[PDB]
Amino acid sequence: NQYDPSLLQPVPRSLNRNDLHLSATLPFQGCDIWTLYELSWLNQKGLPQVAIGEVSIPATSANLIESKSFKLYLNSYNQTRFASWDEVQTRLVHDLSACAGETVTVNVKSLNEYTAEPIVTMQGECIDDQDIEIANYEFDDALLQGAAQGEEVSEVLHSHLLKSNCLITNQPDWGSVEIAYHGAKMNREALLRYLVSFREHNEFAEQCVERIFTDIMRYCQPQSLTVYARYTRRGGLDINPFRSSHQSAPNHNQRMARQ
Amino acid sequence: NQYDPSLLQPVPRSLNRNDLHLSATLPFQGCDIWTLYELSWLNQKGLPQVAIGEVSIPATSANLIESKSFKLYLNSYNQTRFASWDEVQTRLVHDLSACAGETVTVNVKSLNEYTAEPIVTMQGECIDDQDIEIANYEFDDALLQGAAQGEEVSEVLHSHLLKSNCLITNQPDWGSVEIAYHGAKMNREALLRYLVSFREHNEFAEQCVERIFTDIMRYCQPQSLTVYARYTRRGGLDINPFRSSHQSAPNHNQRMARQ
Ligand SMILES: NCc1c[nH]c2nc(N)[nH]c(=O)c12
Ligand SMILES: NCc1c[nH]c2nc(N)[nH]c(=O)c12
Numbered sequence A, B: 001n002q003y004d005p006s007l008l009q010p011v012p013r014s015l016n017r018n019d020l021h022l023s024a025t026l027p028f029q030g031c032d033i034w035t036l037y038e039l040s041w042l043n044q045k046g047l048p049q050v051a052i053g054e055v056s057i058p059a060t061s062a063n064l065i066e067s068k069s070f071k072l073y074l075n076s077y078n079q080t081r082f083a084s085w086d087e088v089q090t091r092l093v094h095d096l097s098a099c100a101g102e103t104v105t106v107n108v109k110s111l112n113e114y115t116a117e118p119i120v121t122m123q124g125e126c127i128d129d130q131d132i133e134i135a136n137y138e139f140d141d142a143l144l145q146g147a148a149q150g151e152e153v154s155e156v157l158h159s160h161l162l163k164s165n166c167l168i169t170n171q172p173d174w175g176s177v178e179i180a181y182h183g184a185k186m187n188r189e190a191l192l193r194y195l196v197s198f199r200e201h202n203e204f205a206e207q208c209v210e211r212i213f214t215d216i217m218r219y220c221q222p223q224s225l226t227v228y229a230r231y232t233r234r235g236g237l238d239i240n241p242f243r244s245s246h247q248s249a250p251n252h253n254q255r256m257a258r259q
């Protein structure tokens, strides 16, 4: 099958935001950063081209794009001849923006642009090295009750232990998550227990990040908050949702060890 | 949801090797290097652990391991408590060795072992920048007929345009491939056309590398030859087959841009 934009499947963001009981105006801003590791098409003479794509979809877009549909759409490029890389980038912007309902940004980069680029970790302190027992992996937002009793602080925490189950497919999704806030100091055991409680929970990556943001806001009430997760790819695409009370986007899209 | 070695499914190497008209005495040595990006289990107190696994399966093993079955086997670790990282490595060596039919090597690495490690490209000259026209996409080993008529050389060539199809999932596989040899200098156009002709060919990653090796050996007759391909992951697992006249293992196992 060749180029087929009808393969793209929008999902309205409002569907799941409903269960978060979000007020008239969003309590966050941000974007979903996608990495497209398997971009490939043919040039006009039929010779294959390969590239990596970077896409930023605004959190305010009416729709997110369902990932399997995004994969199938990209595969439709594989046997299609295009006269230039410019055309490919242009079509991606057009088709993904039409699906999402808002202008998305797309970078199409040749593979040489990645030579010597680093694997990165996240900022601040890892909270994973704790001596606690966990036996109940059922989702429980109430694990955050009274979690922020401490002195007013600014800190950045991260964990590599985020896992949830894919809403449509049950297959596990693996991620790291970075939480930066200014407010009463958060209890790290409670936070890790809460994050681990996603382990047998069904939702999309974007929706998990919004749930973490909204739960921390309601239970811990920081003055400012950013939640950023980076998930490992499925079908050649990864999703990196960023949500913040005050920030727009992360500084870069550098990959982590499992990505 | 517990640890289950019965999920592993072997596939005999003999199926495709018989199709290549090879004897039990191989014309190559080497190994299949796998990267397990999503290795995760529970510690003795039920707290999730995450790691990256690096596995080497000897090319002399009776069997390769089917990738989906390998993924499902690894998933069975996700909700299983293990006493230590050493127990995990031991179980992996035991089960994977049993399935392959020969001792496999396993390294279980913490994610911090990858921090600030650079993405690499392949060695030598990239052959992809050619202004040629491709008229069909049918596999054709005869594209190598008379491809080695240059002076005696030792050189390393590579391409990022290797693609084949995975029949059992109906999904493309994407690879880069590095070819190092001592023999009559190879025609770059013939080599590139040959590799491009895999684009709609069904075979496993390991099998494609053996086909490339044996085709180059019979059509180009180098005195010595090494073929190393690095494929993008599927299901959290990537395969990197290495086959060589004289070398037992590749010089590195570092990830490339699309991996
Ligand atoms: N997690 C499973 C999943 C399936 N399709 C998806 N599409 C998007 N955008 N995000 C997701 O997390 C998923
Ligand atoms: N390429 C498709 C595929 C499916 N399962 C596989 N298992 C192995 N070991 N190699 C492969 O290439 C595949």
Ligand SMILES: [Mg+2]
Pocket: B113, B117
């Ligand atoms: Mg290293």
